[PDB]
Amino acid sequence: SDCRTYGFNTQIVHAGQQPDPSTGALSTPIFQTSTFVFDSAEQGAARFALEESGYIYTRLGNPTTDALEKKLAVLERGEAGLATASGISAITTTLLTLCQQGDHIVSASAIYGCTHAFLSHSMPKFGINVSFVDAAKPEEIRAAMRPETKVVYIETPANPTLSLVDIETVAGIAHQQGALLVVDNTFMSPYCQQPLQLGADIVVHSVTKYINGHGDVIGGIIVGKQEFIDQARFVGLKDITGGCMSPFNAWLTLRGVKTLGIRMERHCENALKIARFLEGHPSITRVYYPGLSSHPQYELGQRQMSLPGGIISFEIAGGLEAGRRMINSVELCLLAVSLGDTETLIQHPASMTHSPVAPEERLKAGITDGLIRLSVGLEDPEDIINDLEHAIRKAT
Amino acid sequence: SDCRTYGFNTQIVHAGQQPDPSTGALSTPIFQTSTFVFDSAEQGAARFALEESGYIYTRLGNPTTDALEKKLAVLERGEAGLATASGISAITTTLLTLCQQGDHIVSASAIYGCTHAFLSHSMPKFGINVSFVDAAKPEEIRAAMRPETKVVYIETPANPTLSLVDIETVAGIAHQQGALLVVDNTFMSPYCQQPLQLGADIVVHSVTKYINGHGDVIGGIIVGKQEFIDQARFVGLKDITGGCMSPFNAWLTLRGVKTLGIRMERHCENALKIARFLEGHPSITRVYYPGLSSHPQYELGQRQMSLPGGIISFEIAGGLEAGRRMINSVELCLLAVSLGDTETLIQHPASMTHSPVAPEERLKAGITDGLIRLSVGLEDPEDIINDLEHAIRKAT
Amino acid sequence: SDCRTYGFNTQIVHAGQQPDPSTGALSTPIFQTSTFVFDSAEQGAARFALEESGYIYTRLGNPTTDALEKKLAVLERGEAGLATASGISAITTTLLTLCQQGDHIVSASAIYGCTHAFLSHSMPKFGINVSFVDAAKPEEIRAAMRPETKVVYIETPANPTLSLVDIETVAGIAHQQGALLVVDNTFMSPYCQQPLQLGADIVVHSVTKYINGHGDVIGGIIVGKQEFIDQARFVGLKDITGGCMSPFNAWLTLRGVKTLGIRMERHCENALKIARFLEGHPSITRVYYPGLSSHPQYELGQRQMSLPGGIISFEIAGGLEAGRRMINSVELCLLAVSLGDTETLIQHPASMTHSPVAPEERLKAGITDGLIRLSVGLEDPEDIINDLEHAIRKAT
Amino acid sequence: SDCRTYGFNTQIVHAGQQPDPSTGALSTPIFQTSTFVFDSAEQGAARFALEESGYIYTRLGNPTTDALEKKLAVLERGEAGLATASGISAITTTLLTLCQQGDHIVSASAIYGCTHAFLSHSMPKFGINVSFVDAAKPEEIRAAMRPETKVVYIETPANPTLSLVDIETVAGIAHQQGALLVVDNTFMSPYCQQPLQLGADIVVHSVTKYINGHGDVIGGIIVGKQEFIDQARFVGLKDITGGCMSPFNAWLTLRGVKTLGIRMERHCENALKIARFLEGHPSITRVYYPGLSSHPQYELGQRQMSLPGGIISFEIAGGLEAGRRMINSVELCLLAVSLGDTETLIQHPASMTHSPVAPEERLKAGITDGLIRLSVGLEDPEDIINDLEHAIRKAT
């Protein structure tokens, strides 16, 4: 039949994949090769002319990575996919393909840190200017638009406090002003949010997080229209970033994504229980989780997201020292800085990653001294709750 | 002892590597992980402050990839190494780290095609201008230098006719005018040429070719001073290209490079025999190989290169149709477009990769209708010669 | 804390694993090595004398495989684990370690085919006799016991019709007569059945099935008391079968088992819906599934198994030709002979694997002409049901 | 053309391999799968009936492993190959396929230790008796033959003192008495010795050593006539040992064997230089190396082996304590117990692996207190010699 006609779980398992034609091998073979052999000069010419289908060289394309790209295109309801060496490379390959000297980008301020560094420091040095706004307020996006604006860039949910951005509304604004909307969908995965269905033009992911899910792959993916993806591939990736994904990494990501549906369900079921526990704890001042009704954009979240996600942020009583004591007291949660793994990961930005940053600067950035970020894993929630409860009691 | 004190073969095997400290495992473990766990908040802070040694996240660094980077730094006699997703990413991470809007690059014209595309089309769109010159003529390099010139960029030997560039002389010119010399050393490998020893500031490789050698890895490496490499890592790679190497790819490259010395010796021994056979064949008009005394820069090659290399180009009588017939007639050599693999690879650019390009344009580019490029593998040279002889006789 | 104290899901994720001590790497490193280096002669001696902990050589032991062995030991509530090259090797390493010439085994008749071949043909040629009985009738097991009986061997659920064996009752019988009970727990996984908790002495698995779950690993595991496992390792594996597991295979199995809990839940949820659909279909004469109340040993299944499993067998109206037409008509289910993968797999033994076997022989073996076996995957059950319904209607 | 017609180096690179038919991928794809899908019931039946070519299930066969098996069959000049989980599994799968209760084996005494354990302790418990003889004396082999003798088993060169066995002569004796000759060719590799060409019926290897060469694979291979290999596969491996090789392990071995020729050349060139250095050292009482003219079977070695090998044993003055001091004093050579890796490995059996064994027993076994075994790697021989010289001077 056709990949795109089955149920979403079926697509997660099957889309982009089929038994190997030569052998019937069920697992997508790992085409861990650099080059491909032509049967004749004609055959080699035909392929270079984009006049015959087939492979040439792994930086350009690869059967294993192609399977991943097709699957993710199906899952996001986009035309085509392009795998990359990292989530960052997905973002930069995209933006460096779209923008040139003199161009402009409107970006949410509440975005991934390394993305913020690329936009704040690197882009301007190539003559590409970026205006940062509070994307939770679509009017700020509109107001920042210029004749030169090529792209509006957003994440949702966003760190550190899991605020949201109204994708459909922002897409409408961007398009009216002649710009593309690029959405980083890393936090949700296509299982929980589909930006393209809401008007976004391009979706990027760090597959390092939920899509792979097993904390053993750095990688990215870009999903969008064929004609954009072709430029991202044959110019952005081929010439500019060189950020191609290893076939083995693609194969691992294909393997990891097989369980995306059941993983997201459990991540989110666990996170809701943990979020409710934290909201009931008198030593916890705030809990940021889209699944709690007190979330400022709760109703937007319910329309836009099928599940509230596996990530929670919360503030512990007693600021910096309490936050430090707490993360130093967990026995099961692991201290680390990524998310979307099968293990529960915890971080305390003020003492761990922003310790030398000025307190008042962190505060402007939404990072309070007592803020803890939690990536909820697949353990028994009771165990995670018990660990948190133990650590919190100790810290306070 | 110290890595850097042993003989070159010993270094190839041992440099950058040692038994795993926890287990004694001899093979470098494949640290196929995305994140790393901190023992405490303090420990996590110390590492983010570049104030304690250790790992954080694989895009930033990884024990497996670190071993590769250290080995290649030793082999090129440079301070530090940085692995990348591809040779292209090694090149662009380097140049995009060094250059910004308003800057200028002087580049050899005779360079890898995708590199030429990045420099010709992509760089100018970021406000970075590039002047192309014939680098076999160091005076053209000097004449093209501007107050804005940050980098002089060269390959040697160069495609398609394996012309050379005098690294030491070019380095002297570049430095006098306040620019860095970047050398793409892919064709030679550190076993055959050491640009840093001749005054180059930075060396890049596609490890896809000889360094890995097994035609199953796309990857790159950058070698240079610590303070440049740190910027290439923490800005160029982290923020701009995102072109990090997969740990599995690093491990394969480490494994492949173990045999670099014996592989280069055999590649070059084979290529010399094949080059001599071709030079003796009345149906072959020209043979381009640094190991033949008739090579225009033969003596430069003998001073600069320890071996003449594993790559040969040659022109077959009868132009385009003869070239086509010949590559269509080989039975052992494989039709493909990479090089430095254990198998002999052959390509006929005029009919395979530049077929729709205008004849007079290809000619300006040094690609004649009858030009064949041969990457000599590890087969018995007698067999390769017999295959070529059979194919040539048929073609003519 | 201690692995064995957490909830079962927590154990699935964490047991046997921890961050790498040298680097903090979260993913268990792939120690893809053959040998291990000693710091001194003394250190090498100490380890060979089983007088110091550490590694020597991968056939004997390996840090990656050790993690897998410890995890599975925890999950089955056994003392120790031993990974093998295949489920068959787990079985034969076990039995060839326990038995010698003159010994005797009582085995269920309803067992995996290759196991039946080893017991029927290979064991007797080594002077080890085997008596086959209907293990659904514990009195047949008792009656077959001899003074020479060392082992009673069972699978449950068993192919082809998913009949059960009362583990606790059989264990009691075996022990009273001085024999060990070995249980092949492949079909259930430790998530659904724990034979050691019911009195079994040794559990074996083909991890090829549910434990790995991703259809890309052939492997086995043995779980039991330390002193038996030590003999299975240092004699059975080291000397007799040589059936060691590759570290990469262990790492993949570790990765796959991370999602065992959520996978089994979904497999079993899907299979129950599909089993009920089949039981309601007038073209289906019989449905074999422990989750259906009409199952002859339904109540035993409810006491012994936490879930009814992901495997269904059923008989289609019209015998051989109908069975053939049906499997030839599925569009989503894949025709293949393993089970426990994320994709739904289907097989029709009478036309596919036992076609040249005599009809009356297959019948004695419980394989009727119209019997279909279905391994339910993680697709949307609605899609699988629709596919089956389409195929069945066509076939009948 | 045909694999078997090219030169040996060409075969090493190409035999058993070709570009992937579906994609042209040059590297053999890693078919890391457990099962294979059939297009129809008929197609599945045809394959189970050994009536159509194709795959079924990885324990039975796999495209990646098939490539390895075909290559090694070509290199040993045998009909067919069978890959296994380890060298031990290659040996036991072979012998357990050939022998049953009541059968007899004549084996060399000077064999691999674990092999000796299997033959001494395990085989007799299955009713298969083994007589050990000094295979350097073919008359002892003849004298030990019985009507029940099915197999004569030898290694050459043999540990610990690299004595030889005359393969052709022993084959003649074995065949006259109606037995098969099985030769463990691990030490030589097919590049240096071809037992089948000298009359042996079956060759086994631990590919863990030189064939893979990179110290990161445990594996074995069996090479022989098709009808024996078919039994070894479909009975020995399928039913008895279950010792199948992982596809990833096969792929690594394929990759490693690409450089077998150039590796053996360098191993042997290095070992000869080191052997000569040791023979000239007044602190070294004996040097065992087939390349030294004083070797007792020197001329046999020159007829039977194309190169003298990469392994050296030698006795240091001062017995046990000197041997201990010496291995504790090396700085470059690595203390470990395998061989055939790219790194130089050293071991001192009397203090490291046989320390608790009785002195007079070790002596009977040819292991003197001062005996050191050296696996020469690919480092600069000058460096290895310098390391040895330093360590020896210190030890004495």
Ligand SMILES: CCSC[C@H](N)C(=O)O
């Ligand atoms: C600089 C490390 S950022 C680590 C991870 N990507 C995260 O989601 O926080």
Ligand SMILES: CCSC[C@H](N)C(=O)O
């Ligand atoms: C666009 C493919 S270029 C292939 C290979 N890098 C070469 O050296 O020619």
Ligand SMILES: CCSC[C@H](N)C(=O)O
């Ligand atoms: C001989 C292939 S058996 C395939 C698979 N092990 C099964 O469960 O049926």
Ligand SMILES: CCSC[C@H](N)C(=O)O
């Ligand atoms: C019991 C370890 S034996 C290690 C290696 N196989 C050797 O050749 O000695």
